[PDB]
Design a binder for this molecule. Structure first.
Ligand SMILES: *Cc1c(COP(=O)(O)O)cnc(C)c1O
Ligand SMILES: *Cc1c(COP(=O)(O)O)cnc(C)c1O
Lengths: 414, 414
């Protein structure tokens, strides 16, 4: 039941109801034999070709369960246990028993989670600069976003401690005190900053979240792109309270265009999210789930982790290329921290108040496109000296050209 | 864009903002080279094979525009023009210029439309019995659902006229008065009833929508499954005012499991749906959209309509089969109408109050299920004499078996 999670949940979310030998005339499935696609053959780099014969193609073209197809869900649960060993797998449902939901990309799960929790006027916690997409999702919900200080190691727990001191810990379960519903964070390779939390910080933030009793929403699309070969423990692995909701993405690792992600957290909150899925998308593409599931079952955890290693090596090499181009052209004209994960470099330009002018007007003129930092803040009209540079795609030639131009422009703009 | 649809739009919906030079480092795309699927071949029955070579696979696995791929959108826009010729294609944006959105199933779009529109306390109109999935969607949004009488030709205009008589026409644009936001209907082959609106009723209803200035939400997943070979004009075809939002579905025709449908309507409302999508699913599967696009462009409008004709002929034979089975076993035991479209027969059992015990314990034993009517009403705890029978899949033999058992169980309680 919802009873320990009710203070977190909206009146509308709580109001949702399920909306999913034997000759049955009771179902509402169309006839699959009418669908025009018949068989599929899918090629896999140095891998086993995936084949959908006639009967698997009928499955793939047909409706399937809201939470995901059972083979994928089971594979992903075992993955989570192997990687995070969450203490909640062993608890009753009311106490936050770990559960998982395949979603249509990890943004879908996150959005349904924000929609589940937020009433207008609710207080929520995040560190700016934050992903512009999360900001635009929170804005129409009408909550006050309360900014927590961050630095090259993510959220500074001293700043969080100081923000929360405006309440008493005893206020949390008092329905008349507007204590924070949650803290939102991207712990690995934050977009735009590139910075990651340390485990020391995570342990410290987790104790605060216990002390003031709010949820941690751990949005982690670069979990599998950490450049340090030992991965940092997640909030999920330390979640003794069942207060963590985790969003994982295949968008950087397997495919972004396939729209397959997954949400993991306390069963009663996952159930709310699934009930919302049941009246919207109904489920993620059955076809794309079968493609991924067949790949992952043939790979095993081991083949999966080898591919992740391969992808990390590529991004590591790209990261070294962009840092060298920056060392070359931008030293003394700008500041940046080495990215700990992900695909972005966050550059603070010296001696210029707002950089938006410099990029939109002048850089474009020169055939170079960087992104200004403005859209990563709650007040995006405030001036910004930062720009986000992507290193996922550019060649070393193109990075060299891009930074000469940026160097030229920094200097000309004084 | 908004001011004259603002009256229909929630506060949250209107607050949403957009959330989507030879060298660009400004982009947020992962490298598609890292994704493990390299090429794909999908066969089409008596059609040309769909091939994703190396470069088209990279595109299929990558993010794409929130409203859909440009080639699917243009092909669908030309389809709507051919089938419906909406008055609205020539209007400026603000006055409701026709626009289209590809969605992850037609239900995603419907859900985003209800959410975009409804504030707690709002009045909405519809006819019961209605789709249980629609009812579960509306329930948590807190609106007053006002039932409109329907019969075997669908919504009865005189009932609509009488209900609306409780409001003044000139209160519609009074912000302080709570006139109906919209009429929701499924005008071909309503699930569960199988009945369809006639064009005369459509004209009448449209004129009422104009008089009381509400929107029509035309949810039309069986439009391509009409058993009269000449299709009824749609609300979209007569939409001089730009007050019609139309949801189309490929689910019954091409594939339910690919999660591709689309929404047509006034650009300012479609714009609101898109902005919601940009912070949730982001877009529908690029892979699935490209498979469908290749299919449709190769077929052209003619191959598409020939395919549709074959699906109608198939379902039309199932309809005949289930009707014969009904005549054989149920004459003088039940009442039903012949379905005008869709895949359901709706049966009233005579001389019984609630079928729920009759089916969900007594008939399950003999190995037969049909859906009790309760879930198709706003108050599902009320007793129902009705059963919904699907004819999409069962063979004529299994139909005989189910109606034999049904006939028997009714005898055992007459
Ligand atoms: C890349 C990324 C994602 C992934 O989006 P999906 O919906 O999983 O495709 C989510 N959040 C951030 C901040 C990202 O950078
Ligand atoms: C079958 C059906 C649909 C189809 O939904 P998709 O999201 O397009 O699969 C929608 N509404 C009703 C009433 C239906 O019966």
């Amino acid at each position: 039941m919802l009873e320990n999670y009710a203070r977190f949940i909206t009146a509308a979310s709580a109001a949702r109801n399920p909306s999913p030998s034997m000759i049955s005339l009771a179902g509402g499935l169309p006839n699959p034999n009418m669908f025009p696609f018949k068989t599929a053959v899918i090629t896999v780099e140095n891998g086993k070709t995936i084949q959908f014969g006639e009967e698997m193609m009928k499955r793939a073209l047909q409706y399937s369960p809201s939470a995901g197809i059972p083979e994928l869900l089971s594979w992903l649960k075992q993955l989570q246990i192997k990687l995070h060993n969450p203490p909640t797998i062993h608890y009753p449902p009311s106490q936050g028993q770990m559960d998982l939901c395949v979603t249509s990309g990890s943004q879908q799960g996150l959005c349904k989670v924000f929609e589940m929790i937020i009433n207008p006027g609710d207080n929520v916690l995040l560190d700016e600069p934050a992903y512009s997409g999360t900001l635009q999702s929170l804005h129409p919900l009408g909550c006050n976003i309360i900014n927590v200080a961050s630095d090259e190691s993510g959220i500074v727990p001293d700043s969080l401690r100081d923000i929360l001191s405006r309440w008493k810990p005893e206020d949390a379960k008092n329905p008349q005190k507007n204590t924070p519903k949650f803290l939102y964070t991207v712990p690995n390779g934050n977009n735009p900053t590139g910075n990651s939390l340390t485990s020391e910080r995570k342990k410290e933030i987790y104790e605060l979240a216990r002390k003031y009793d709010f949820l941690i929403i751990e949005d982690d699309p670069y979990y599998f792109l950490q450049f340090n070969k030992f991965r940092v423990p997640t909030f999920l692995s330390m979640d003794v309270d069942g207060r963590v909701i985790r969003a994982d993405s295949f968008s950087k690792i397997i495919s972004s265009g396939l729209r397959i992600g997954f949400l993991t957290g306390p069963k009663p909150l996952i159930e709310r999210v699934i009930l919302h899925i049941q009246v919207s998308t109904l489920h993620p593409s059955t076809f794309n789930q079968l493609m991924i599931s067949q790949l992952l079952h043939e790979w095993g955890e081991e083949g999966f982790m080898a591919h992740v290693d391969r992808v990390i090596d590529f991004y590591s090499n790209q990261k070294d290329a962009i840092l060298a181009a920056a060392d070359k052209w931008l030293t003394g004209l700008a500041e940046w921290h080495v990215p700990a994960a992900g695909m972005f470099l966050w550059i603070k330009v010296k001696g210029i108040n707002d950089v938006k002018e410099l990029i939109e007007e002048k850089a474009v003129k020169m055939g170079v496109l960087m992104l200004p930092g403005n859209a990563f803040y709650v007040d995006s009209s405030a001036p910004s000296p930062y720009l986000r540079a992507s290193f996922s795609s550019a060649s070393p030639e193109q990075m060299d050209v891009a930074f000469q131009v940026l160097a030229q422009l920094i200097k000309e703009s004084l």
